[PDB]
Amino acid sequence: AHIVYDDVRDLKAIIQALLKLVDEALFDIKPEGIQLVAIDKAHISLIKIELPKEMFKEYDVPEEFKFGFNTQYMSKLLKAAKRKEEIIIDADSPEVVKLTLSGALNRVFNVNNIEVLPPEVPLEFDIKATINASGLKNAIGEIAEVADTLLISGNEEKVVVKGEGENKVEVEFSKDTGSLADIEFNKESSSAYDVEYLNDIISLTKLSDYVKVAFADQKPMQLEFNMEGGGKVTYLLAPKLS
Ligand SMILES: [Zn+2]
Ligand SMILES: [Zn+2]
Ligand SMILES: [Zn+2]
Ligand SMILES: [Zn+2]
Ligand SMILES: [Zn+2]
Ligand SMILES: [Zn+2]
Ligand SMILES: [Zn+2]
Ligand SMILES: [Zn+2]
Known part of the structure; x- marks a missing residue:
């Protein structure tokens, strides 16, 4: 797998929201794009992410793989990434994912993959x-x-x-x-x-x-956030009676 995305700030905004719902989550990296679903413990709020290949500068993923990660760990890795800069992801084995942050002069992180099972995932509106x-x-x-x-x-x-x-x-x-x-x-x-x-x-x-x-x-x-390239992040929140 080899992926280049043009704006690490979007991943940062996604991780900031995820860490408030879950401590760990899973990016399902497939040949056609990346998907993630996270639901909080109480099953009251959920976030779904769909990032098609078309939205990336480079996206070459001949084989799918699941990248499990700790949300606070990733938030801190990304912490010093204030400007719009490219992020490169290359993974040759399940075990580790190499993340390279460009511009704001080069940072490389070798992130060890961890086991994370995806929520047992299961809409009309007025x-x-x-x-x-x-x-x-x-x-x-x-x-x-x-x-x-x-x-x-x-x-x-x-x-x-x-x-x-x-x-x-x-x-x-x-x-x-x-x-x-x-x-x-x-x-x-x-x-x-x-x-x-x-x-x-x-x-x-x-x-x-x-x-x-x-x-x-x-x-x-x-709430649906439609991104450039076809990306979409969806947030769902259960209701109170009044
Ligand atoms: Zn590869
Ligand atoms: Zn909270
Ligand atoms: Zn490349
Ligand atoms: Zn590679
Ligand atoms: Zn009326
Ligand atoms: Zn009317
Ligand atoms: Zn409250
Ligand atoms: Zn009320």
């Missing part, structure tokens, strides 16, 4: 809204500072998020707020979620300018 990622990020952070639950409601024109309780750090996403690019509307809906979980994965918002937010009354919220 509203699916494409909204400004930074706007959502701001909203999640502000609500988390003052509430424990984020309420979301949507109709044919907008999605509104606010914290549950007295006054409201309320934020509206719509064309008239210049933050909604598109919306698929089936039925007006309102749901509730633990904002602590959403704040944990806020780094995924660096992956794309827009995020597709999908939900239905008392059903999971789904």
Whole structure:
């Protein structure tokens, strides 16, 4: 296997979110691309990653292999990688993966593979809204500072998020707020979620300018981050009743 990706910052943002859900995870490296699924202990939130070969500068993987890793270990390896730089992965045997960070002058890490079994992995929505990622990020952070639950409601024109309780750090996403690019509307809906979980994965918002937010009354919220080249990271969060 030999892979070159043009921007280590995206892997960094993915690892920052994963370490909040799990201590270990598994990249399933196949000839057509890389996949990963991680679910937290309580089976309340999950992250799925799909990185097709088409999104990499170089991707030559004649044989599949599973790369198990400790999320905090990888976060610290990547810690000193602030600028957009290439990351090269070459693995000739199961046991170790060589990661080379380019630019910001050369760092090479030989990472030993560890055993990690993939979650025993098992979607209809009332509203699916494409909204400004930074706007959502701001909203999640502000609500988390003052509430424990984020309420979301949507109709044919907008999605509104606010914290549950007295006054409201309320934020509206719509064309008239210049933050909604598109919306698929089936039925007006309102749901509730633990904002602590959403704040944990806020780094995924660096992956794309827009995020597709999908939900239905008392059903999971789904956030989809579509990346350039066909990449997609999906975050799923179980609902509260209200
Ligand atoms: Zn090879
Ligand atoms: Zn190469
Ligand atoms: Zn090789
Ligand atoms: Zn109405
Ligand atoms: Zn109407
Ligand atoms: Zn909570
Ligand atoms: Zn947490
Ligand atoms: Zn509540």
